[PDB]
Symmetry: C3
Subunit: 330 residues, 3 copies
Amino acid sequence: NDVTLVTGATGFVGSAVARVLEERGHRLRLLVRPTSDRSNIAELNAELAVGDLSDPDTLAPALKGVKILFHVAADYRLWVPDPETMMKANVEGTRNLMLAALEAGVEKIIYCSSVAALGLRSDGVPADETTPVSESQVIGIYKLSKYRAEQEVLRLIREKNLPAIIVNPSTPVGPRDIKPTPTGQMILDCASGNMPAYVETGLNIVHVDDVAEGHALALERGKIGEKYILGGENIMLGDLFRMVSQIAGVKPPAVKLKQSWLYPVALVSEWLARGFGIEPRVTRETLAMSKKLMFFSSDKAKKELGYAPRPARDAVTDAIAWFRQHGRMK
Amino acid sequence: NDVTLVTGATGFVGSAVARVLEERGHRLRLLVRPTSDRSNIAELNAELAVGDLSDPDTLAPALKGVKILFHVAADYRLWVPDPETMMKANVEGTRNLMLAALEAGVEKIIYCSSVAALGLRSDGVPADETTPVSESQVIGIYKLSKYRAEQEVLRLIREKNLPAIIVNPSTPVGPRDIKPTPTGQMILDCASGNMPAYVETGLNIVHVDDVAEGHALALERGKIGEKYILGGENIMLGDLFRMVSQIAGVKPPAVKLKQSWLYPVALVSEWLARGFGIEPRVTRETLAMSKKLMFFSSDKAKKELGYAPRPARDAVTDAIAWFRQHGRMK
Amino acid sequence: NDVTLVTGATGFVGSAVARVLEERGHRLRLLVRPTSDRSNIAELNAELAVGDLSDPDTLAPALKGVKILFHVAADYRLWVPDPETMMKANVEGTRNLMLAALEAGVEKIIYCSSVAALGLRSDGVPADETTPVSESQVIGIYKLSKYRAEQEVLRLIREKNLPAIIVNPSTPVGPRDIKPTPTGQMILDCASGNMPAYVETGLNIVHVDDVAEGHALALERGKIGEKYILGGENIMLGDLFRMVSQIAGVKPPAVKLKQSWLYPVALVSEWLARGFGIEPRVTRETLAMSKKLMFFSSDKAKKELGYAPRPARDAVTDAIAWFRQHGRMK
Ligand SMILES: [Hg+2]
Ligand SMILES: [Hg+2]
Ligand SMILES: [Hg+2]
Ligand SMILES: [Hg+2]
Ligand SMILES: [Hg+2]
Ligand SMILES: [Hg+2]
């Protein structure tokens, strides 16, 4: 009657979301995989349900007696040999979960999505929940997957009155980055001195604990059918590495490749594929999309939810302090 | 009773075919998906039906009262980040549409397929509808998708009495190339003096209005179960570029890369994959297939349907003009 | 119920299976695909059921009156342009087949899997049936495919009482390598003097007929539910080539690339991908997995089954002769 189910709780975001809910005193049930590793888990007094999103039979048991569902992705950019197969399984998995929660009579669903599902501006002014997005401008399987999944949730919200509120975190950094996420691995390589080169670009960094808190705020004050960007700070990658290096007491990376220098590679790529009669993975048309800065505003969640992200330097600082104490810099 | 249905009408080939059928006085229904840009369409006075091939349930309404179906590929050679997923949708969609059309009692189906579904020769004698082809000779997802789709149409002709005539256009060029098409893009790069190199290739260029006409002609004179190639001119790529440059009044590109110089990249490609335990995208064997000239004959369509295509010059000349009037070039 | 059924008999590994089953006086029936060139079923005394693992309906017929089933994948490491689609087809073709075998009352099933489905050691001690594996450790699609299909067969064994014994060959070398197999290609490139360089790995080479023997020996002495490695010799790739070259009467390749030299290539690949916003196909984590020697122990098949394979030397010798006689060597 009173159970909060969170999925993806072994992940970086999932577990931080779980901790927040716990300190707010929800009764937790955590869906985990048959495989799965309960390491940043045992910390939580929590019911554990075992299940798997691709098979709707194991989900009803887990959603019995559940009032509130937080759907958080199991991983965050987990590399795989089969990316197209993973995108189908993740899109369908989300659909099964959403339909199952609907069927079990869950009252409120908070769906964790991502800025990767959202649109971009070209003039370098930060994008928001209103920026138009089209399938034809999405560039990789990671983003395409987040885009398709988010579109599924919006279809179910409209066609079937799914009581879902959507959250779109930017790129979370912070302590407890166990696998390291890709952004963690970059911060680690850099803090360690072993990152000689990099390709410039723009991203938005957000403390993982702020993402977490923002999920709780969406449950408390968010409106069914709305998306809310959960960003922190719009930062260039060079500036990020400047901060990492200054905090870690090390030399910043020597080599900065401008994105416009990838143009020739794009061109060669188109010529190789043509010459071989295959599809290029990368083209000039590809580069012109990925050139855009990934800059987002969190103003909608600021006004509408009282979301208060701490600055990017705080997230980077904690992530490094944690990496040092936990042996990751060796 | 008497409606003509046309899919892919927003695309380059689809809308030409649509226009041709209107000057012939057919009543048009356009199968369309929900976000489709309505801009290429407006000039037609057509019923629009929103429907999605991947799903049988949506098609029966779009087929009520339809005497004639033109199934034209939604896109032409559109790069995607999920080529295999799109292949599944093209192949399954075409099956669905074809079953739904049997179930709705459609009297004629013109199926738009491509020379990419057909077999190639190695003596540089132009191939035709008769050239043998086997699934294992086909080297990219794009050609494989078209080969498999056509096989399905052939199966349903043979097993379920599907009343389909098949049309196999070569590579269409001309006005109204809005995206543009990858070939229009080569036209553009070349016309403006920024294609410094190209890999020698041979292909077959057809005026996009000849493809559209050929489609109308196949309905009026073609026999159920027959494939007809709708080509124009077989031309080497360097000759196509020398022609483009002369028309645009610039210097031809002067760096022509032989295909055989790709060997060492194909070698390095196999060894790199082996060293990383993955599948190479490109092998020595791929390269032997890519070598073959995409030369084709339209003799069957000229003799059986009256098809009278124009030279490549007209196609390229018309493309450049349009590109000029609508600001893609000077 | 008299007939021994074998799929993939047209394959390199099937062609060896039948041969050995003739030598044993099983009454054989060979499942065989409508296309597939029937070259190795040629003068075998066998029934000729035509079928396709993709749909259950061609199977009910071919299975009827069959006591013993050997399921051998027909394509050994076949490069394709659609590898994830092929993995789906191989997993489901195996599920279908196994379900049809239940129906038909088959007593014993011999499943051909592969060491690719198994775990690997980091220390370079040969791994065995017992070595732990998880999905996330798995490096390429071929491996993933083999892994998933076996995880399927293990499920049917467990929960539906599939009467299957599992066999895991290492890498087959010998006569009748038609495509060839990627390894056969490496033997041709080597035997002809066309291999300047190679990356150093370890491999387990097994005479293709010893794999055949192993299949039969598994039938006659092996427990339901158990796996059996069917290997030969663990050798470094370099020694393999010295071996191929001496037998070919040619100079060995003299460029041996260390595995650790790919590390900057992995790095470059991660950066180009980040810059182009696509998923890297190869990363430092990939490289760490693929560094491991593909080394395996056959002790279990030796003890439970009296498997006694020959040295790798014989395999290479049988294979080169075959190549020479069929006119594929310079
Ligand atoms: Hg997320
Ligand atoms: Hg650094
Ligand atoms: Hg077409
Ligand atoms: Hg040019
Ligand atoms: Hg096998
Ligand atoms: Hg060699």
